[PDB]
Design a protein around this motif. Structure first.
Motif, short mmCIF file in Angstrom:
data_model
loop_
_atom_site.label_atom_id
_atom_site.label_comp_id
_atom_site.label_asym_id
_atom_site.label_seq_id
_atom_site.Cartn_x
_atom_site.Cartn_y
_atom_site.Cartn_z
N UNK A 49 0.85 -1.19 0.00
CA UNK A 49 0.00 0.00 0.00
C UNK A 49 0.89 1.24 0.00
N UNK A 50 1.62 1.47 -1.09
CA UNK A 50 2.57 2.58 -1.11
C UNK A 50 1.87 3.93 -1.08
N UNK A 51 2.67 4.96 -0.80
CA UNK A 51 2.18 6.33 -0.81
C UNK A 51 1.69 6.71 -2.21
N UNK A 52 0.82 7.72 -2.25
CA UNK A 52 0.23 8.22 -3.49
C UNK A 52 0.71 9.62 -3.84
N UNK A 53 1.91 9.98 -3.38
CA UNK A 53 2.47 11.31 -3.59
C UNK A 53 3.58 11.32 -4.64
N UNK A 54 3.73 10.24 -5.41
CA UNK A 54 4.80 10.13 -6.37
C UNK A 54 6.02 9.37 -5.89
N UNK A 55 6.02 8.89 -4.65
CA UNK A 55 7.14 8.13 -4.13
C UNK A 55 7.15 6.73 -4.71
N UNK B 98 13.68 3.57 2.04
CA UNK B 98 12.36 4.18 2.06
C UNK B 98 11.91 4.47 0.63
N UNK B 99 10.60 4.40 0.41
CA UNK B 99 10.02 4.90 -0.82
C UNK B 99 10.12 6.42 -0.86
N UNK B 100 10.73 6.97 -1.91
CA UNK B 100 10.96 8.41 -2.01
C UNK B 100 10.61 8.88 -3.42
N UNK B 101 10.56 10.20 -3.58
CA UNK B 101 10.58 10.78 -4.91
C UNK B 101 11.97 10.62 -5.52
#
Lengths: 119, 121, 116, 119
Positions: A49-55, B98-101
């Protein structure tokens, strides 16, 4: 999730993975040739369930370098993130630890980085 | 004696693992640090036929930091070896991504080292 | 607190001077045949809130007697007090061909103390 | 050789001199993080192998100058590979000063590749 399928690194290795609904990663890691002697089990986890902000989507997996044909007495873990799109990527850093005696433990672990693409 | 059991790292995290005959590692991890609460699923692999020359047993496992309570959008992998003895130990080094931009990806990965014993330090 | 002689967990000796300009200079012994030059940098104005002092240094494994064609960098922090420590992680890169570059770099950790 | 002006994949500028005694000296300008110019020092193998292997090296920047202090330091460890497009391939560790309770998250890891051309 976009993760399930076949991925290729920069150096001719291939892995086929299934990303399960619960966060499981399962599959096989092999060489470009794909002969049986080069294939190994992989198992890991990803953020389902990853973030939805472009990450990107965080994930990791392990291969122990033993199969029915050979055994290097070692294991690699890859830690990284999946980035989707038309040019999807899995960008990773890895640690490869060999079984050693205590006297040789200081030189047991190699470090590097792999980038995986769908092509 | 062996990998299967309950382990603790130097910070008091709890690593409950089962080493299967096929080389599979399964179990749960509870972290004493970070954006984490209660138990998380782990899976990994280990060498089920180690060398007989006194070398340790290579292994690795992954936790994605998502459970029913929290989601940190990150994952840790531990890579290391089990060393048997009077004080059995698993010595590891770890990567926490971590998941990042893309702009923040350069700072996406922490690195450290954890040592686990069946006796809690 | 950094200047002086330090000892790691495996019998190596680290002799360093921390200069006023942020420089680290000294020698690393893993006798004469085993002594190597080290240079690095440290934070000369650390916080005074209980945090450690960030630092790093490099040894290239060549001296007048031997050459391993490799170099180690240690990255870490100095922690002062009654049991002062330098806590580090390290990377050891060997010169390789391109075909062997994937296995060029070892990683590990060293803890240094003021007593053996 | 190593002496010259290099750029990493994110646009940082690495101005280095390789001295006769194995010394690296120069300045680093980061295109990333809490960073103008910072002093760097390091070491390199001044007598590499003659079999096609690269030249091992490393250097450190402490992120303090006359304008900012991040209370942190980066080391790069890698090798110089000569040729038509010379390159320095590195992996790096970035350690911040922390309390003991926060030391577990004190160190970031990554990889930088340097060329004599801007990205």
């Amino acid at each position: 999730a976009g993760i399930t399928g076949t991925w290729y690194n920069q150096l001719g290795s291939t892995f086929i993975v299934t990303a399960g609904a619960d966060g499981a990663l399962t599959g096989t890691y092999e060489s470009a040739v794909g002969n049986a002697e080069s294939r190994y089990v992989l198992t890991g986890r990803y953020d389902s369930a990853p973030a939805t902000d472009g990450s990107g989507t965080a994930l990791g997996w392990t291969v122990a370098w033993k199969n029915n044909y050979r055994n290097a007495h070692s294991a690699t873990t890859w830690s990284g993130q999946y980035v989707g799109g038309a040019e999807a990527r899995i960008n990773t850093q890895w640690l490869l630890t060999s079984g050693t005696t205590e006297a040789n433990a200081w030189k047991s672990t190699l470090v590097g980085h792999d980038t995986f693409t769908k092509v």
